[PDB]
Coordinates of C-alpha atoms in Angstrom, one line a residue:
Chain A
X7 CA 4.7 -0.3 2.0
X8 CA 7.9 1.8 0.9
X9 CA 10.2 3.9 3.5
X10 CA 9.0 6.4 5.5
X11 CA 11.5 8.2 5.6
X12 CA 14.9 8.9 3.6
X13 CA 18.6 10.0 4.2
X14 CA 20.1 12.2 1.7
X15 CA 23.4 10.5 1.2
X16 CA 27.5 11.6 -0.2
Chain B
X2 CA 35.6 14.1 9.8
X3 CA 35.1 16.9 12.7
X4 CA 34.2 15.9 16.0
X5 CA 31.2 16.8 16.9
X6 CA 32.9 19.1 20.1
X7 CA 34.7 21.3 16.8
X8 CA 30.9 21.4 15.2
X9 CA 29.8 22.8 18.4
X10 CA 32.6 25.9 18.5
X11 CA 32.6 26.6 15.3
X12 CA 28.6 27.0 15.5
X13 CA 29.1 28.8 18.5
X14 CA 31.5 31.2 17.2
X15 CA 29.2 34.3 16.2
X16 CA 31.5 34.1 12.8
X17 CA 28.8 33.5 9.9
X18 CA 31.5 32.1 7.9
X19 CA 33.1 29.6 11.0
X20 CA 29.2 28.5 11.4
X21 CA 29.0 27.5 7.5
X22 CA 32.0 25.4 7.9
X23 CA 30.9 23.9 10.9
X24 CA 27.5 23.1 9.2
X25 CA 28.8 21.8 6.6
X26 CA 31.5 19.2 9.1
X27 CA 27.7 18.5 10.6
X28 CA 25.8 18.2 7.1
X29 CA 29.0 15.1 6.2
X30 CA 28.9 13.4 9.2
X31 CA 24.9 12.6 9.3
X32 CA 25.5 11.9 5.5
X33 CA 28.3 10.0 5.4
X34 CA 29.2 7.7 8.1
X35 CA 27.1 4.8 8.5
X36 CA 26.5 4.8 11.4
X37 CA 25.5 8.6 11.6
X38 CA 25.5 10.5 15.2
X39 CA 22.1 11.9 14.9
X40 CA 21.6 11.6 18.7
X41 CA 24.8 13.1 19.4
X42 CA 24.4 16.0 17.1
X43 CA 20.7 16.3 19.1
X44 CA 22.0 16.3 22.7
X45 CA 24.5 19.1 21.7
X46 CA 21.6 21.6 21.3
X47 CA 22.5 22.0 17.4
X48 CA 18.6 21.9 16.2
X49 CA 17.5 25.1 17.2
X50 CA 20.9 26.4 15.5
X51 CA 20.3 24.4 11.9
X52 CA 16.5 25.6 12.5
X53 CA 17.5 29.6 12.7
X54 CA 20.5 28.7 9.7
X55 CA 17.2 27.8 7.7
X56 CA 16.5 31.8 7.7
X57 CA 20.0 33.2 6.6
X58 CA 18.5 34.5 3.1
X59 CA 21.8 36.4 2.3
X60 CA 23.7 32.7 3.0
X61 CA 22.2 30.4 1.1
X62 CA 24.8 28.4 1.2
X63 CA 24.2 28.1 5.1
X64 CA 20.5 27.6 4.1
X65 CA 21.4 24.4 1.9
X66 CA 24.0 22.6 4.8
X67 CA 21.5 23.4 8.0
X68 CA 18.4 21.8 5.7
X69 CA 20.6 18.9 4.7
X70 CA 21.7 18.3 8.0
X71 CA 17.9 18.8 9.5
X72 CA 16.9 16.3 6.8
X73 CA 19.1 13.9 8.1
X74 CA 18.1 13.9 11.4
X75 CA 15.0 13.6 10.6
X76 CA 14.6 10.8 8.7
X77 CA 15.7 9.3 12.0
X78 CA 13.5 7.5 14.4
X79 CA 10.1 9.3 15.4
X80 CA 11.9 11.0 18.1
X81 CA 14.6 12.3 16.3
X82 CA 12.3 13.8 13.8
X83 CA 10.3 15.3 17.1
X84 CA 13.4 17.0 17.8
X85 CA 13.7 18.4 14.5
X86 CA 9.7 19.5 14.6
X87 CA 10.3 20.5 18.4
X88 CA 13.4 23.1 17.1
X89 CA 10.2 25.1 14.8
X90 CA 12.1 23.5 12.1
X91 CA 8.1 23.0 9.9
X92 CA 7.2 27.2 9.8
X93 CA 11.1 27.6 8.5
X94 CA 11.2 24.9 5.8
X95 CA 7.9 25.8 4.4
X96 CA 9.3 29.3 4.0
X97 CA 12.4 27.3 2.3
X98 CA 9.8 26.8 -0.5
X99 CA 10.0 29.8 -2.2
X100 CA 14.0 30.3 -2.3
X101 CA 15.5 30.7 -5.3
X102 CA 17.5 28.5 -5.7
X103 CA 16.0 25.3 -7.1
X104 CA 18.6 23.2 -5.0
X105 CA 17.8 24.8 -1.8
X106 CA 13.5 24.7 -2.5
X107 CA 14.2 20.9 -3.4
X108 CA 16.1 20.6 0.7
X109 CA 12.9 21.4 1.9
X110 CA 10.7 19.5 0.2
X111 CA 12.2 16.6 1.5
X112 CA 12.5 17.3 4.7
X113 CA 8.7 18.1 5.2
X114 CA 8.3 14.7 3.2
X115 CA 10.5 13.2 6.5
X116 CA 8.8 14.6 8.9
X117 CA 4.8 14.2 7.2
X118 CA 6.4 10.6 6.7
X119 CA 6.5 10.1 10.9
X120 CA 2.7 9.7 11.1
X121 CA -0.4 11.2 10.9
X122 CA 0.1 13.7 13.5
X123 CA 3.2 15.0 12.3
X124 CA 1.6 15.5 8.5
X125 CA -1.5 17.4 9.9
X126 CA 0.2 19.4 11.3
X127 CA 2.8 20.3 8.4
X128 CA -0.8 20.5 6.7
X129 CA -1.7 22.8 9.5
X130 CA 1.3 24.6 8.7
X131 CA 0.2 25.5 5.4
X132 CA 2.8 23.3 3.3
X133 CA 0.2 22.2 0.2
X134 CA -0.3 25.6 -1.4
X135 CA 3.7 26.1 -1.8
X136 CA 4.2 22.4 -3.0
X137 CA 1.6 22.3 -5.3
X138 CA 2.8 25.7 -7.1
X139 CA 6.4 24.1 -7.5
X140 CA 4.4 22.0 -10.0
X141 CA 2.0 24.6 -11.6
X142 CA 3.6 24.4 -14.9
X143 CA 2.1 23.6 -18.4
X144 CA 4.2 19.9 -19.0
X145 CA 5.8 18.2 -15.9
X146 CA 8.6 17.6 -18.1
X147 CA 10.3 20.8 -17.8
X148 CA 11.2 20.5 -14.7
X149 CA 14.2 18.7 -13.5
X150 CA 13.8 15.1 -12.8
X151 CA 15.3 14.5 -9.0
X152 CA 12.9 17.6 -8.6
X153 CA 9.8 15.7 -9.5
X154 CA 10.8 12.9 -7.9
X155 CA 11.1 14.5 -4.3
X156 CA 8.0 16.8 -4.7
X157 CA 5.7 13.2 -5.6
X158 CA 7.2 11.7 -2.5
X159 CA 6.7 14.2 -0.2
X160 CA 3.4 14.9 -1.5
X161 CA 2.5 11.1 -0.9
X162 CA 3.4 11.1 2.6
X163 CA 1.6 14.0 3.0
X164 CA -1.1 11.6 1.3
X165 CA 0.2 8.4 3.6
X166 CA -1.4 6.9 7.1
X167 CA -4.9 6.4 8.4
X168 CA -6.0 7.0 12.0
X169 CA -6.8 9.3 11.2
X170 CA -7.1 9.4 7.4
X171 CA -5.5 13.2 6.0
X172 CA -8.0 16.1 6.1
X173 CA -10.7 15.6 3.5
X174 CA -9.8 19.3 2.4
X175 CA -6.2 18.4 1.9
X176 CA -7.2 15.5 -0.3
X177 CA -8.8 17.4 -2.8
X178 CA -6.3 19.9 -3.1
X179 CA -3.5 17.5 -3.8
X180 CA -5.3 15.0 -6.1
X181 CA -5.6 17.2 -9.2
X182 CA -1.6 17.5 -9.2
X183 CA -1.3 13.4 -8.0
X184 CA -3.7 13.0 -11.0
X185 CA -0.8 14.4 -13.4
X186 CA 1.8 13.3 -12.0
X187 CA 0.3 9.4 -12.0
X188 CA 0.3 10.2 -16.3
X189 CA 3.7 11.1 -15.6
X190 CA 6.4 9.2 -17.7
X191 CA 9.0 9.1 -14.9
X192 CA 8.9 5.4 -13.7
X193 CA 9.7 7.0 -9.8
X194 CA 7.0 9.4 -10.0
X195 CA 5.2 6.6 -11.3
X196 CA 5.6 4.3 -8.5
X197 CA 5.4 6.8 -5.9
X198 CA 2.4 8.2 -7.5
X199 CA 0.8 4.8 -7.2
X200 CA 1.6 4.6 -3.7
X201 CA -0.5 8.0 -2.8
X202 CA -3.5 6.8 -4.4
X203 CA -3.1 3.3 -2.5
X204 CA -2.7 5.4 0.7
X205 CA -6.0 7.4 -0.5
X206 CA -8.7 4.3 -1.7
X207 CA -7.6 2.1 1.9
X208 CA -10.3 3.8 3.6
X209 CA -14.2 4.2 3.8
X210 CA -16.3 4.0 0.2
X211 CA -16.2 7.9 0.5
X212 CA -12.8 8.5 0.0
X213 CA -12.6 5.7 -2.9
X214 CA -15.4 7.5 -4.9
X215 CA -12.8 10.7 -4.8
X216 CA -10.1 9.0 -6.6
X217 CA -12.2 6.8 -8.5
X218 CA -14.6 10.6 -9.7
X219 CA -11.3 12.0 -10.9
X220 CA -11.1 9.0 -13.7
X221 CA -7.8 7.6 -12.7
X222 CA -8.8 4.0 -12.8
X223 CA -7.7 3.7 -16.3
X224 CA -4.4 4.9 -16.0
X225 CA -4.3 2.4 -12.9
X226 CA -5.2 -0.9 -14.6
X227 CA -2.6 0.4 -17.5
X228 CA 0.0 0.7 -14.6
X229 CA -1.3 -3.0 -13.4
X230 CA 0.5 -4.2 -16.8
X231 CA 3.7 -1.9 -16.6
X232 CA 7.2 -4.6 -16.2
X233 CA 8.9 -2.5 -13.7
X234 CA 7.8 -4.3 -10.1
X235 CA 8.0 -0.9 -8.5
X236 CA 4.9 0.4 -10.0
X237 CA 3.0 -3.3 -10.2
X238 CA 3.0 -3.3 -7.0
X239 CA 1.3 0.2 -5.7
X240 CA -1.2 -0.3 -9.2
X241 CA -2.1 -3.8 -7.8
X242 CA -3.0 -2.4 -4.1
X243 CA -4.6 0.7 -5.1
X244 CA -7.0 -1.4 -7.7
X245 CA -7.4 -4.2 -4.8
X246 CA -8.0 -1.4 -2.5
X247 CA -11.1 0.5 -5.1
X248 CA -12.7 -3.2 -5.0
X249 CA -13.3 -3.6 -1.3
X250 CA -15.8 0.0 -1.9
X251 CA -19.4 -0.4 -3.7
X252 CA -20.5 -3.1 -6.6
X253 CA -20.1 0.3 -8.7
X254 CA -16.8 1.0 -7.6
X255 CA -15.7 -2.3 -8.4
X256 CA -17.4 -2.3 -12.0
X257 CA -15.2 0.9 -12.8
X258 CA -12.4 -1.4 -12.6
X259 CA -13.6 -4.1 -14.5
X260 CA -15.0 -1.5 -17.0
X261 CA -11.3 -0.1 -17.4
X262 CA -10.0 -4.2 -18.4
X263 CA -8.2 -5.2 -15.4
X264 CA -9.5 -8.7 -15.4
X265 CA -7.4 -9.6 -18.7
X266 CA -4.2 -8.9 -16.7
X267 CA -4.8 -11.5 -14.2
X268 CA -3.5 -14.4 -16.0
X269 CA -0.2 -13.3 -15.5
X270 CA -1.1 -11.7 -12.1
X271 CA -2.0 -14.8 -10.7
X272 CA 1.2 -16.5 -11.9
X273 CA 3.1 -14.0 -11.1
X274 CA 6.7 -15.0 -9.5
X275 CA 6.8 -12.1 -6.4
X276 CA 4.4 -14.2 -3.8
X277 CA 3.3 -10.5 -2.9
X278 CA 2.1 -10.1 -6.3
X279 CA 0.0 -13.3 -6.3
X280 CA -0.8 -12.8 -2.6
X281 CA -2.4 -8.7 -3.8
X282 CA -4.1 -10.8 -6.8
X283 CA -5.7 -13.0 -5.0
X284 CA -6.8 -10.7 -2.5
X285 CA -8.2 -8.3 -4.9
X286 CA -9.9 -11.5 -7.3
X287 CA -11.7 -12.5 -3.7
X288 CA -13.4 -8.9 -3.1
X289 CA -14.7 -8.8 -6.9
X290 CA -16.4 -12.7 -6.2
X291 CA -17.8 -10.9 -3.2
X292 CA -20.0 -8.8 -6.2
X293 CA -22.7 -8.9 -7.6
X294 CA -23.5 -12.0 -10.1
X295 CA -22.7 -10.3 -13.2
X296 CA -19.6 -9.2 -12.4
X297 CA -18.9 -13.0 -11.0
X298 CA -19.6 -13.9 -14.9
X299 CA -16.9 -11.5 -15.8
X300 CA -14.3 -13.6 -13.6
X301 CA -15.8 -16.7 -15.5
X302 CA -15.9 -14.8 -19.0
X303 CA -12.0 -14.3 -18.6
X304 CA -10.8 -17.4 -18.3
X305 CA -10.1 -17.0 -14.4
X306 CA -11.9 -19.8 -12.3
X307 CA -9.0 -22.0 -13.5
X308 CA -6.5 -19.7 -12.4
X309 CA -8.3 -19.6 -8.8
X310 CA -7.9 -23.4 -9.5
X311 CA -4.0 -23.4 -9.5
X312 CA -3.7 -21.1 -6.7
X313 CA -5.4 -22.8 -4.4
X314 CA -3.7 -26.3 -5.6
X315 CA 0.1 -24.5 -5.3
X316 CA 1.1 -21.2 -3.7
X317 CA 2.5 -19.6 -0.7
X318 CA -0.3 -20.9 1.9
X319 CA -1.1 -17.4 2.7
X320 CA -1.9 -17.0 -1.1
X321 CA -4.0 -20.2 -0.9
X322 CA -6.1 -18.8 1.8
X323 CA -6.9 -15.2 0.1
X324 CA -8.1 -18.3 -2.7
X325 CA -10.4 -20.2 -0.7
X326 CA -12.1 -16.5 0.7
X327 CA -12.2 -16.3 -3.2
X328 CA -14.2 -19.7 -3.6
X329 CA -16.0 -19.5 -0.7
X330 CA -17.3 -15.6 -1.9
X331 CA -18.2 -17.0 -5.2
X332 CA -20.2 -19.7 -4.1
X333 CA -21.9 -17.1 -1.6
X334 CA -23.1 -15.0 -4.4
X335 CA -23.0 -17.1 -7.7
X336 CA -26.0 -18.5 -9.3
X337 CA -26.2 -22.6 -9.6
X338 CA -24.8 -22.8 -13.1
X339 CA -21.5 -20.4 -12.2
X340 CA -21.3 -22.9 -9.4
X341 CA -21.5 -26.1 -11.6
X342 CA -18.8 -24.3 -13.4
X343 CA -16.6 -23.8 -11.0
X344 CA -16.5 -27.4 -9.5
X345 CA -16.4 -28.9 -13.8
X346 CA -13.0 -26.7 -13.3
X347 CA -11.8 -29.0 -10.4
X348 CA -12.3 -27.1 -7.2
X349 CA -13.1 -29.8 -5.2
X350 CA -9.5 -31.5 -4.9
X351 CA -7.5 -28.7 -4.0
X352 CA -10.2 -27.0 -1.7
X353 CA -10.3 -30.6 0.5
X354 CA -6.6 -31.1 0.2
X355 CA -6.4 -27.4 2.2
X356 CA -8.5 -28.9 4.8
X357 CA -5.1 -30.4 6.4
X358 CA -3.9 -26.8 7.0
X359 CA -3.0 -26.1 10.9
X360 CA -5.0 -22.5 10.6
X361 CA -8.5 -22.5 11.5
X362 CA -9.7 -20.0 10.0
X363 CA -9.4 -21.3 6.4
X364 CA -10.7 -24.8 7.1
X365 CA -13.9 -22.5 8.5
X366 CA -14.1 -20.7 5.0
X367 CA -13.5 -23.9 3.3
X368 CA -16.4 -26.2 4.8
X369 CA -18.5 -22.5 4.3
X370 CA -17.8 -23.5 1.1
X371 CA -18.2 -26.9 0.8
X372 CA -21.7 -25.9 2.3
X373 CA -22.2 -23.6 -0.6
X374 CA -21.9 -25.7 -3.2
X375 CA -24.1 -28.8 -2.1
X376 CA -26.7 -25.5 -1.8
X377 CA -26.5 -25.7 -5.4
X378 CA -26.1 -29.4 -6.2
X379 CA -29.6 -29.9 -4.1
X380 CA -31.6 -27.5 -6.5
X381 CA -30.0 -29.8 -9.0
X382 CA -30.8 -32.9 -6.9
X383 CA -27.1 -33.9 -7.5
X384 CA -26.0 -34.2 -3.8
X385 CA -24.7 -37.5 -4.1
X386 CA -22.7 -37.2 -6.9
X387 CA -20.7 -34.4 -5.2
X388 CA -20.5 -36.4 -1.8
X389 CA -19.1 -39.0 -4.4
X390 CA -16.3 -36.6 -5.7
X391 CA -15.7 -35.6 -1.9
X392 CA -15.7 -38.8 -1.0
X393 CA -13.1 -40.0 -3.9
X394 CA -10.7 -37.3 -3.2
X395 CA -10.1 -38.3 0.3
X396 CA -12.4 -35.5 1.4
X397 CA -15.2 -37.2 3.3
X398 CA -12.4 -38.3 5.6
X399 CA -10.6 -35.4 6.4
X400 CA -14.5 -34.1 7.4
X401 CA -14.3 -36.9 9.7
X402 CA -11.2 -35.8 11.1
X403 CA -12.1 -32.1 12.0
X404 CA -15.5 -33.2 14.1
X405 CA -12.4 -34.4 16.5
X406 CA -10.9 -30.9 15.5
X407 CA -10.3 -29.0 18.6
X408 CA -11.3 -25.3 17.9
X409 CA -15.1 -24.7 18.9
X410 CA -16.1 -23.6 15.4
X411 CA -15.1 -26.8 12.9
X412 CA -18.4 -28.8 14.1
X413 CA -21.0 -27.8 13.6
X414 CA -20.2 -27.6 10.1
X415 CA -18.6 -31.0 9.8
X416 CA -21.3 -32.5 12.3
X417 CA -24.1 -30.9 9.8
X418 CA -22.4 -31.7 6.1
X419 CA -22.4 -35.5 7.4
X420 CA -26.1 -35.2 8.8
X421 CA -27.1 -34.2 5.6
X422 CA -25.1 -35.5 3.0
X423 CA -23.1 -38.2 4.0
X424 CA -25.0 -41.2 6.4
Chain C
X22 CA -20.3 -12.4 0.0
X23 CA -18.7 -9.3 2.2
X24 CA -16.1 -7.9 0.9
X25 CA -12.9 -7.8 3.3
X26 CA -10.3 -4.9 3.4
X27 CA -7.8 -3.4 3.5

């Protein structure tokens, strides 16, 4: 499946 | 680039304005390096700091830098985000809903998505929290399409995680909360939303026949097998497990789909150049030749026994084994003339070429098969002639071979096919 | 013909 989880980057 | 022994005193310092700064040194360093310190930032004791920045109402400023920086750590590993759950970040964020500032509202939203997106336990209890009545009124508006769109976007993605994971499956409450808002947002023309609106209702139909009927009562099954033809990959993909996913429930279940035309889209399905693609196809072609014998003539009506015939002459061998279940489910369940049809389309070569595979398990479903259709070739009385085909394909030998195959269950299968067909 | 998931 897709990420779990994401990181809000710049 | 502050170290993260200057983050420490300025968020030490009592000075609300020193504590910003330092939150925002914090907030750059977990979004900027690649290598981020999130550990380091942990074993300093910042959480419970961020986690009380959360309820500075007269800084929202502060507000945005301590829910970036929370976000961040934890979309970490699972326990990074237990430290973030651990510092009472979920009461605080959920309050975070109903700031203001759209910017702010939006911070939160994806960090309950990051920590929902840990696992099951971790979304109950955001759940538990009481995070679906906020959510869902960020979307109670007339048309989706006033609101901005990286917005949307976070709001469908946390609200599929919230959506996301089985053992156990979300509360059954929760589920029919979200889905009216899912249901919109899946009509949505945002190809994000889109795809991550797809991959909820995936999340929702893998489980029991109950929870399929609750997706499949709210009439999205339509909309699905439209967004089984769209071009972008990212929504194919979701579409094409979520309709595999409504086949594997009742006969009536599965007719829904065929009702709704996704059989005329697996032509190109089953061609398809992602081996997932082909791979989900197959799969989901397998549990509708599991059905009933009218829906069996629907395969046939469409043209796609001799695309069941190419996959199992040449794909990935995975592939080639979701098309021999297909086969050996059709043959289960077909009447004698859908069987004749299937072997005038040319099943026999490829099925006894795949009986040189190193996996067990298929050659099992393929001499299941094999069985299957002299079933039908003895109310016809034609045995021989199919022992003939076997036979001139190189088949008969290669059931010689595998009664000296090793694994217990080849045998009696081999052993009984010659018995009765063969000497 | 059982249909297998998921």
């Amino acid at each position: 499946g897709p990420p779990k989880k994401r990181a809000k980057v710049d | 680039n502050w170290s993260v022994e200057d983050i420490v005193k300025g968020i030490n310092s009592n000075n609300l304005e020193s504590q910003l700064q330092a939150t925002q040194a914090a907030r750059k360093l977990l979004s900027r390096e690649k290598q981020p310190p999130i550990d380091n930032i942990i074993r300093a004791g910042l959480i419970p700091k961020f986690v009380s920045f959360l309820g500075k109402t007269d800084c929202s400023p502060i507000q945005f830098e301590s829910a970036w920086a929370l976000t961040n750590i934890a979309s970490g590993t699972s326990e990074q985000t237990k430290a973030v759950v651990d510092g009472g970040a979920i009461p605080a964020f959920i309050s975070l809903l109903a700031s203001p500032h759209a910017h702010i509202s939006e911070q939160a939203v994806w960090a309950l998505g990051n920590i929902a997106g840990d696992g099951s336990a971790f979304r109950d209890l955001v759940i538990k929290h009481g995070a679906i009545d906020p959510l869902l009124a960020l979307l109670a508006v007339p048309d989706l399409s006033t609101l901005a769109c990286g917005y949307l976007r976070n709001l469908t993605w946390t609200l599929s995680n919230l959506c996301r994971n089985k053992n156990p499956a979300p509360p059954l409450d929760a589920v029919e909360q979200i889905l009216p808002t899912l249901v919109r947002l899946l009509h949505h023309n945002d190809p994000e939303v889109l795809a991550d609106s797809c991959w909820a209702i995936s999340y929702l139909t893998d489980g029991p026949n109950e929870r399929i009927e609750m997706v499949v009562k709210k009439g999205v099954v339509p909309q699905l097998v439209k967004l089984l033809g769209a071009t972008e990959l990212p929504i194919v993909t979701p579409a094409l497990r979520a309709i595999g996913n409504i086949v594997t429930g009742t006969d009536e279940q599965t007719q829904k789909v065929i009702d709704a035309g996704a059989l005329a889209v697996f032509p190109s399905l089953l061609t398809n150049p992602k081996t997932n693609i082909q791979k989900e196809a197959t799969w989901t072609m397998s549990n509708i030749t599991a059905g009933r014998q009218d829906q069996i003539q629907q395969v046939v009506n469409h043209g796609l026994v001799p695309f069941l015939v190419g996959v199992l002459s040449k794909a990935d061998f995975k592939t080639q084994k979701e098309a021999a279940w297909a086969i050996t489910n059709y043959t289960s369940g077909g009447t004698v003339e859908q069987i004749v049809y299937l072997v005038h389309c040319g099943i026999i070569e490829p099925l006894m070429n795949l009986l040189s595979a190193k996996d067990t398990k298929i050659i099992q479903v393929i001499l299941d098969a094999i069985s299957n259709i002299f079933q039908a070739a003895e109310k016809l009385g034609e045995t021989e002639k199919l022992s003939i085909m076997i036979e001139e394909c190189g088949g008969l030998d290669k059931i010689e071979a595998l009664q000296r195959h090793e694994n217990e269950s080849v045998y009696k299968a081999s052993l009984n096919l010659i018995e009765k067909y063969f000497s």
